[PDB]
Design a binder for this molecule. Structure first.
Ligand SMILES: NS(=O)(=O)c1ccc(NC(=O)Nc2cnn(-c3ccc(S(N)(=O)=O)cc3)c2-c2ccccc2)cc1
Ligand SMILES: [Zn+2]
Length: 259
């Protein structure tokens, strides 16, 4: 639980009072203008190595729900692309809307998607996530857009346990989940230096945003929208519209992995 949230009185336009870096030089998310982004032939191939991923728990944290992973060894890692070295998967979570036309944090030519998946990784050269959070290259987030259409079979195990974590602070066992089932076919991406999109809004994230969205069904996203921001026995306030709007690009260049 925190004072910050996504409502009128505690939402993104308020965050700068407790977290002044909200008005910083490298905030996220941003609008990705596909006609300004530069193809970068020097980007190395992107390597998503999730075959040994060990999921642990699923948790409603009051601002999203997250699936956590064992990051005590190199089990599920991201390498290559714009990254130097090895980044370990810690958790994934989502952002979504009240209607299918909004929910994503990144936008593409101002287009908003129904939701956005964030797979959060930290740079093993800093030894733990707490230390990585203080570095300009400490974190890498793989962002994947969700559109409503056909169901995503690899999401259904998540959807089916959400009624066990309805309110803030609820958690459940979530072992043997394979995050490979959440990925689109293509790893074509855009990349730029940015920040966490929630407090503390730390400016230490390399963003990698895949061009290809995954499709999920209307029934799948409807189940996200039944979650609650509130803890058990407080007024019911649906967990919807837990996205930060696009921020000023300032002096940054978005690079593309593809022509
Ligand atoms: N491996 S483990 O022990 O089970 C484990 C597993 C995750 C955590 N903690 C955790 O995930 N904290 C937390 C909650 N939300 N966020 C968070 C929020 C926003 C973004 S976003 N939209 O991608 O910019 C990314 C991450 C985190 C977090 C995680 C790492 C660094 C900073 C924050 C602690 C322990
Ligand atoms: Zn996120």
């Amino acid at each position: 639980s925190h004072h910050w949230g996504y409502g009128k009185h505690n939402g993104p336009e308020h965050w700068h009072k407790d977290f002044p870096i909200a008005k910083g030089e490298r905030q996220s998310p941003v609008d990705i203008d596909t006609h300004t982004a530069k193809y970068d032939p020097s980007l190395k191939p992107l390597s998503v190595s999730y075959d040994q991923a060990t999921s642990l728990r699923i948790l409603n944290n009051g601002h999203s729900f997250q699936v956590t992973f064992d990051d005590s060894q190199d089990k599920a890692v991201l390498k290559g692309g714009p990254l130097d070295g090895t980044y370990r998967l810690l958790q994934f979570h989502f952002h979504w809307g009240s209607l299918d036309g909004q929910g994503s944090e990144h936008t593409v030519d101002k287009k908003k998607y129904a939701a956005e998946l964030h797979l959060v990784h930290w740079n093993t050269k800093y030894g733990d996530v707490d230390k990585a959070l203080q570095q300009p290259d400490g974190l890498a987030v793989l962002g994947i857009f969700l559109k409503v259409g056909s169901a995503k079979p690899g999401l259904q195990k998540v959807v089916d346990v959400l009624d066990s974590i309805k309110t803030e602070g609820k958690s459940a066992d979530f072992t043997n989940f394979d995050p490979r089932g959440l990925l689109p076919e293509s790893l074509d991406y855009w990349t730029y230096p940015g920040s966490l999109t929630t407090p503390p809004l730390a400016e230490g994230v390399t963003w990698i945003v895949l061009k290809e969205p995954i499709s999920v069904s209307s029934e799948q996203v409807l189940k996200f929208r039944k979650l609650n921001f509130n803890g058990e026995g407080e007024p019911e306030e649906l967990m919807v519209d837990n996205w930060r709007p696009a921020q000023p690009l300032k002096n940054r260049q978005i690079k593309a992995s593809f022509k």
